[PDB]
Design an enzyme around this catalytic site. Sequence first.
Site, PDB file in Angstrom:
ATOM      1  N   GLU A  35     -16.659 -33.989  47.201  1.00 42.78           N
ATOM      2  CA  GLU A  35     -15.468 -33.711  46.973  1.00 42.78           C
ATOM      3  C   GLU A  35     -14.747 -34.493  45.866  1.00 42.78           C
ATOM      4  O   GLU A  35     -14.218 -34.136  45.202  1.00 42.78           O
ATOM      5  CB  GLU A  35     -14.869 -33.883  48.403  1.00 42.78           C
ATOM      6  CG  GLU A  35     -15.157 -32.683  49.310  1.00 42.78           C
ATOM      7  CD  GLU A  35     -16.256 -33.076  50.192  1.00 42.78           C
ATOM      8  OE1 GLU A  35     -16.149 -32.521  51.450  1.00 42.78           O
ATOM      9  OE2 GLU A  35     -17.096 -34.071  50.023  1.00 42.78           O
TER      10      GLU A  35
ATOM     11  N   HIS B   8     -18.741 -38.709  47.638  1.00 44.10           N
ATOM     12  CA  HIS B   8     -19.113 -37.422  48.197  1.00 44.10           C
ATOM     13  C   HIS B   8     -18.886 -36.385  47.153  1.00 44.10           C
ATOM     14  O   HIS B   8     -17.925 -36.686  46.260  1.00 44.10           O
ATOM     15  CB  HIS B   8     -18.330 -37.311  49.581  1.00 44.10           C
ATOM     16  CG  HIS B   8     -18.565 -38.396  50.569  1.00 44.10           C
ATOM     17  ND1 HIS B   8     -17.944 -38.706  51.595  1.00 44.10           N
ATOM     18  CD2 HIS B   8     -20.047 -39.059  50.598  1.00 44.10           C
ATOM     19  CE1 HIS B   8     -18.548 -39.440  52.564  1.00 44.10           C
ATOM     20  NE2 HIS B   8     -19.808 -39.793  51.920  1.00 44.10           N
TER      21      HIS B   8
ATOM     22  N   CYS C  24     -15.661 -34.847  55.414  1.00 41.58           N
ATOM     23  CA  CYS C  24     -15.595 -35.911  55.948  1.00 41.58           C
ATOM     24  C   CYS C  24     -13.899 -36.265  56.009  1.00 41.58           C
ATOM     25  O   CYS C  24     -13.326 -35.831  55.268  1.00 41.58           O
ATOM     26  CB  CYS C  24     -16.245 -37.234  55.618  1.00 41.58           C
ATOM     27  SG  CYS C  24     -15.436 -38.085  54.233  1.00 41.58           S
TER      28      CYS C  24
HETATM   29 ZN   LIG Z   1     -16.672 -37.119  52.365  1.00 40.16          ZN
END
Ligand SMILES: [Zn+2]
Length: 184
Positions: free
Chosen positions: A62, A60, A91
Amino acid sequence: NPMEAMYPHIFYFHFKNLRKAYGRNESWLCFTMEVVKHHSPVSWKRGVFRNQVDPETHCHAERCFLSWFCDDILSPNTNYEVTWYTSWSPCPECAGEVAEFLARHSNVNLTIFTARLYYFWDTDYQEGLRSLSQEGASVEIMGYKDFKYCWENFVYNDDEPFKPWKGLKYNFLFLDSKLQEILE
Ligand SMILES: [Zn+2]
């Protein structure tokens, strides 16, 4: 990755702050970073991360930020003030890692502005965000001024002015109240 900018249509599409966001399946993340080395003036980095699902480097956005930051930027003795502007809130897996990271590297401070809240009513997701608020990180919702800033800094804007979508401010208030409530 990190790119220097997004296309206009990717920005307007992925950063639109609607409650029902079909199908924004990626997360995008603009960042600024104030690097405070200790006997030196301040310097700045600026960029954009998209999440990856190529061959075997799934992250992701991040995680990609964090992998890039550690592998190539984190340096002896210097401090860091990072800001994120993120299409989706994180998330809870991502929020998990980030909160680790902060607690562990206390020379880094992190503000996260998010355009949209992923599943704001669900507690696993509320958990991530509470976790990040706990480890120091501010968590805000992007408002008009933040969209204007990212337009002006992370997009191939052709020097044109930001064009806000209708409902931008209303959506901001709805989402802010949801944030305030989640972060008791
Ligand atoms: Zn994530």
